[PDB]
Amino acid sequence: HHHHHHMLSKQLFLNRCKDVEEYQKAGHNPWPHKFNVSITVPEFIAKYSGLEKSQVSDDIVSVAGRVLSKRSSSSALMFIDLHDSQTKLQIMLNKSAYENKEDFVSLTKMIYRGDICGFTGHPTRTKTGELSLIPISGMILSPCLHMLPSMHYGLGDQETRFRKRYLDLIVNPESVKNFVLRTKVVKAVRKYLDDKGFLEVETPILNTIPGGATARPFITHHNQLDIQMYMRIAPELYLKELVVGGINRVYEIGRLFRNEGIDQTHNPEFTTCEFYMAYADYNDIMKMTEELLGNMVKDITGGSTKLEIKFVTEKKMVLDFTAPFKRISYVHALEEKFGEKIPRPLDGPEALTFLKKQAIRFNAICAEPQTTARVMDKLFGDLIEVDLVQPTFVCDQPQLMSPLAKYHRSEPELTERFELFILKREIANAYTELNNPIVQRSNFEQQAKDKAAGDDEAQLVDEVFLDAIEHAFPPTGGWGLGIDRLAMLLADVDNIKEVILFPTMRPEDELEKKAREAKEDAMVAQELA
Ligand X SMILES: NCCCC[C@H](N)C(=O)OP(=O)(O)OC[C@H]1O[C@@H](n2cnc3c(N)ncnc32)[C@H](O)[C@@H]1O
- Binding region for ATP: 258, 266-267, 270, 485
> CA dist 112 to 13, 33, 73, Å?
12, 20, 17
Residue 55: name the closest of 130, 125, 122 by CA: 125
Binder to its own copies among 23, 98, 119, 238 (CB under 8 A)? 238
Whole-Å CA distances, 438 to 104, 210, 381: 81, 21, 32
Scan residues 300-359 and list those touching its own copies (CB under 8 A). none
Q: Which of residues 354-413 bind its own copies (CB under 8 A)?
A: 406, 409
Distance CA 286, CA 270 (A): 23
DSSP-H helix ranges across 384-460? 437-452
Stated as kind and residue range, the H or E segment containing 128 is none
Is 236 one of the binding residues for its own copies (CB under 8 A)? no
Handedness of CA 392, 393, 399, 405 (dihedral sign): positive
Binding mask 410-429 for its own copies (x = CB under 8 A): ------x-------------
Residues 250-279 touching its own copies, rule: CB under 8 A, are 254-255, 257, 259-262, 268-269, 271, 278-279
What is the nearest approach in angstroms of its own copies to the Cβ of residue 275? 14
Dist CA 429 CA 490 (whole Å): 18
Per-residue HEC secondary structure of 142-208 comes to ECCCCCCCCCCCCCCCHHHHHHCHHHHHHHCHHHHHHHHHHHHHHHHHHHHHHCCCCEECCCCCEEC
Site for ligand X in 414-473 (CB under 6 A): 426-431, 433
Question: Which one among 95, 266, 516, 519 touches ligand X, defined by CB under 6 A?
Answer: 266
Q: How far is the CB of 308 from ligand X (least distance, A)?
A: 18
272 binds, among its own copies, ligand X, none (CB under 5 to 8 A by kind): ligand X
For its own copies, give the closer residue by CB, 196 or 361.
Answer: 196
Q: What type of residue sits at position 102?
A: E
Which of ligand X, its own copies, none has residue 480 at its interface (CB below 5 to 8 Å by kind)?
ligand X
From the list its own copies, ligand X, none, which binds 227 (C-beta under 5 to 8 Å, kind-based)? its own copies
Piece of the chain touching its own copies by CB under 8 A; list 73-81, 242-250, 286-294, 382-390 = 242-250
What's the min distance (Å) between Cβ of 233 and ligand X? 7
Residues 477-516 binding ligand X (CB under 6 A) are 478-480, 482, 484-485
Residues 56-115 that bind its own copies (CB under 8 A): 64, 66, 83-86, 114-115
Size of the site for ligand X (CB under 6 A): 23
Q: Are 216 and 319 in contact (CB under 8 A)?
A: no
Report, in Å, the least distance between residue 353 CB and its own copies.
Answer: 33
CA distances from 493 to 117, 123, 157 (A): 34, 39, 16
79-106 per-residue burial string, b: 16 or more CB within 10 A, e: under 16: bbbbbbeeebbbbbbbeeebeeeeebee
> Are the C-beta atoms of residues 176 and 165 closer than 8 Å to each other?
no
Q: From ligand X, its own copies, none, which one binds at residue 448 (CB under 5 to 8 Å depending on kind)?
A: none
Please tell me the distance from the alpha carbon of residue 126 to that of residue 92, in angstroms, as a whole number: 9
In this structure, are residues 297 and 306 in contact, taking their beta carbons and an 8 Å threshold?
A: yes
Applying CB under 8 A, does 161 fall inside the site for its own copies?
no
Is 451 a residue that touches its own copies (CB under 8 A)?
Answer: no
> Which residues, numbered 190-229, are part of the site for its own copies (CB under 8 A)?
194, 199-206, 208, 216, 218-225, 227, 229
**Choices 118-126, 141-149, 187-195, 268-276 (CB under 6 A): range interacting with ligand X:** 268-276
Cβ proximity to its own copies: between 118 and 391 the closer is: 118
Helices within 339-424 (DSSP H only): 349-360, 372-383
Residue at 305: amino acid letter: T
Residues forming beta bridges with residue 422, ordered by sequence position: 425
| Positive or negative: CA dihedral 84, 88, 89, 93 | positive
Cβ density class 460-474: b for 16+ within 10 Å, e for less: eebeebbebbeeebb
Closest approach of Cβ 428 to ligand X, in Å?
5
Instruction: For ligand X, give the closer residue by CB, 116 or 213.
Output: 213
What are the backbone dihedrals phi and psi of residue 300, each rounded to the nearest 5 degrees, phi first? Answer: -135, 10
What is the x/- site pattern for ligand X, positions 269-308, by CB under 6 A?
-x-x-x----------------------------------
Decide if residue 207 touches ligand X (CB under 6 A). Answer: no
Q: Interface with ligand X includes 241 (CB under 6 A)?
A: no
Binding residues: 258, 266-267, 270, 485
Give the footprint of ligand X on this chain (CB under 6 A): 212-213, 234, 236, 258, 266-267, 270, 272, 274, 426-431, 433, 478-480, 482, 484-485
